[PDB]
Point group: C6
């Protein structure tokens, strides 16, 4: 990461083990982001290359990065000119993704006034592609989450918000799913109980209300 310092063996080992155990579960992404705080594109690519298997996902992730790189290039067209002494060039999508830049060039951009934070830019595009993959490898839809007739409310809520966490939707949409589906898809016994509090009640209140039942 940036200081340039080498990425620690236990950081790398942690990243590897995460993916083995959990595959593309939503929580892998914060872990990824945690493990890569202050990382350079080289460090980010290293991290992605140390994954074996899951190559279809890694390929999708590539394309997503290429798309983001091409978008960057459009907004930031590179001018012809000799980079003057005591000064650094403008980066291109490929430099951000680490394919056409060096470690020093990456070091150069990130430590400067102003900083051109290619680490945090590329990191944006990578997390972007990880969400698509999580979203894609999630098997079920939030509309299919229903409470079984004997299922403790708490377990339904765990399944509801787990499936929700992986959904393709903005916040306004997710608020709406919470507001509509949660109560809608409860089993009749508890569905009754909850309606009897109305739509101003907290999840604490709802969980404690259908607790016994």
């Amino acid at each position: 990461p940036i200081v340039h310092q080498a990425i620690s063996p236990r950081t790398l080992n942690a990243w590897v083990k995460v993916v083995e155990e959990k595959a593309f579960s939503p929580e892998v992404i914060p872990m990824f982001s945690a493990l890569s705080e202050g990382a350079t594109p080289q460090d980010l690519n290293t991290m992605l290359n140390t994954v074996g298997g899951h190559q279809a996902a890694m390929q999708m992730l590539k394309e997503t990065i290429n798309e983001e790189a091409a978008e960057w290039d459009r907004l930031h067209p590179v001018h012809a000119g000799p980079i003057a002494p005591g000064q650094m060039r403008e980066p291109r999508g490929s430099d951000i993704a680490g394919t056409t830049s060096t470690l020093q060039e990456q070091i150069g951009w990130m430590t400067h006034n102003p900083p051109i934070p290619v680490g945090e830019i590329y990191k944006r595009w990578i997390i972007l592609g990880l969400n698509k993959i999580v979203r894609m490898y999630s098997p079920t839809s939030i509309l299919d989450i229903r409470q079984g007739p004997k299922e403790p409310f708490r377990d339904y809520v765990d399944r509801f918000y787990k499936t929700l966490r992986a959904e393709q939707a903005s916040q306004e949409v997710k608020n709406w799913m919470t507001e509509t589906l949660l109560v809608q898809n409860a089993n009749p016994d508890c569905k009754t109980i909850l309606k009897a509090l109305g739509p101003g009640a907290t999840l604490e209140e709802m969980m404690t209300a259908c607790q016994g039942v």
Copy 2:
């Protein structure tokens, strides 16, 4: 945490493993607090996102945070004005919870004269919500803790104060439960023995007194 330094792989790994093994047992909270000393809201959210499962709890925790955020906003209304050079804006609940602020904005508030410690503020609200969840996921009530007819006193006391640690109550109330229930719910044999010391006796004295019996 704050120095900004990345949160260590073993910190993160420790937090993950805690929750797998112990779920929402009261001792997870000091561990949480320990693992997050000097943490920024970004670091705190990272920690909370690396939990898979337990999403109903995480949702309740969200609401609790929103409530605390809205309370903060009431007491601290944000004024319109250009933030002047060499100066930093007033935070809003959403900035404290990390949703509408950057890492630098968080760094900005925490390192300053005076410090505006959004790390320790948000941490307050998170622990708050963890207590509610611990409290909620605790199965039994302190009123149900009774000594079995053959149960070594020491084992009853362990169950008493374990259930007590998870109770919804203030200190005055807990003193009262200790003072009333402990001796009240002992089995007849030992209940006799203890009454014969009176209400000035130490737990050491009480445990050593019903030791053989």
Copy 3:
């Protein structure tokens, strides 16, 4: 601990694992003390809260701390007055135990000329309470330790000094137990052998003497 630095994940993890494996065996206490070198009351309380189970002991430990706190208060009565700029208040038992002081207040006392070392003071009271608990949870008495008729001397000596380490007694008393009981409670065969050296002989000499027998 003090530098304020956060307490390390492996310190915390070490403390947790100690108590799981060994419970309240005498050696847990040096470990505790080792793991808490330079710790603040907050750090000490953290460490104590990360223990689940064993709550009867933790309760006794509380009372012991309250007793020590009340004793401190007697010897150190707090005066009314405005704490003047460039100066720090006098601590009360509750501040030492971490319940009515902040991290900075604790930092304040410990780093100063002179230092008011609330870390090492509270640590005193905690170890105090741990000894009582070790002492209490020790099953046997040193008077009950006798050498079996076929028991290798070395194994008797291991049981003797293990039970001894956990006894409620001062040094003068322990010298006396060593001097009297060790030789007194040996089996007849070896009891003879040892008497034949007298009371000036080293444990090395005694162990090597009853070695074959």
Copy 4:
């Protein structure tokens, strides 16, 4: 690595364990490169010597290094002359590979104005030889990767790009394999589906399209 600092026990241990578990799988190479950031030729050779077994590969790796060393020597012929005070000699292939230079000589070249980065040069030649070995120890060819009649598309894509990652080919060639083979070798059912999007469709679109089938 360079600061000279000793290479960490966990770095070394990590490198050893990598090769035991994964042999010469493509992902071992980024791991190698990660574990050796800032390494000297001595450190690089150490790392290679701590591998037991796999000696045929290590021998091929040697030859590759000798070839690269001899190529370096051709482009950089060494001049006769006394190395003047406050100055450092020109390196030869053998000095780069660590066989005819010292630690200080390596330290000398790497820290200087300009730097002569024998660490990153030799590292180039080593990774070069690792690719040949990965390439060689890869059992299958990309032309043999076909989708089974019941095989979920996602699993075919994983096998396609895994075999692809290990192929001997430049980027232009790999683009061509992706463009031609992937769709060509799909099973008839899904082959139809995909043709019906054409050759402008993303892997996301293709995977989600043959998802159900």
Copy 5:
């Protein structure tokens, strides 16, 4: 250890695990010494207290320390006088063993011109007592080590020098045991072979000579 720095959790954990696995095997002592480089008497005592079991040995170790303490006191008698400002007292055996001195007093002696290295002095006395215990808990004598009629020479030599390492003897004596016993106690077949080289032959030569046989 000394800088005062707290002793690391993994140092402590390492020391504990050593004794569990290996008991009092000669190699535990270098490990002890390794783990305690730069340690204060407090740190040394901590290390010794974290051992459970083996208390007979710990008791012998105590006595040995008391003997060394009393010897120190004889050679270094303490003078009456007020320790003057900017100056430090003379230590007594009990101060060296950590029983009548503080951490600062220990810090005081060790960092000074001249240094009074109570860490390395007490460490001397501890290793002293560990040797006696190793020596004592070693079951066999070097005179009993004989080569079996089918026993590979190499295995006899391993048993010879293992038993030798644990013997009570000075270097002159050990040279003599090597010189006399090794060849003396070999089985007739190989005993012949070796005599036929004479007493100027290396262990390499001797091992390679009785290799096949």
Copy 6:
């Protein structure tokens, strides 16, 4: 190692575990050398003492060191004279091996203008003795390595160069063994194939040539 800094618990633990698992396999030596970068003779001896078992080897290693020490003494005879203030004595073989010098004396020699690097000198003599032992404990000879009639070429090459790595021979000799034996000892089927490339062919070419067969 040198800064004097204590040798890390994980360094020591790593060294111990290496020898347990791998005994005296050639790769243990680079590991040894890696783990001991910048080590003092005291640190080197510590490392060697933490090995239990394998004492015949450790004894041979001693003799080898004594031989190297006596050779040093011959080339470097010690002069009589008072070591003058601001100056350090000339070392003797025994000082290099750590038996007649202190930690400071070792520190003294290694940090100086010029440096007298007793760490790297003694390390030379130790690795020297480790090679002899590896060489000796290697069971087979390179002349005995033949390809089985069904044995994949790659597996023969692994056995060839593994046995080769442990051989007593200089580089000129090893080049010759490679050049002569490898092709000579192949099975008839593949022996034919290879002869048909001649003696200018790379191991890559040879391995890929007998690949199918």
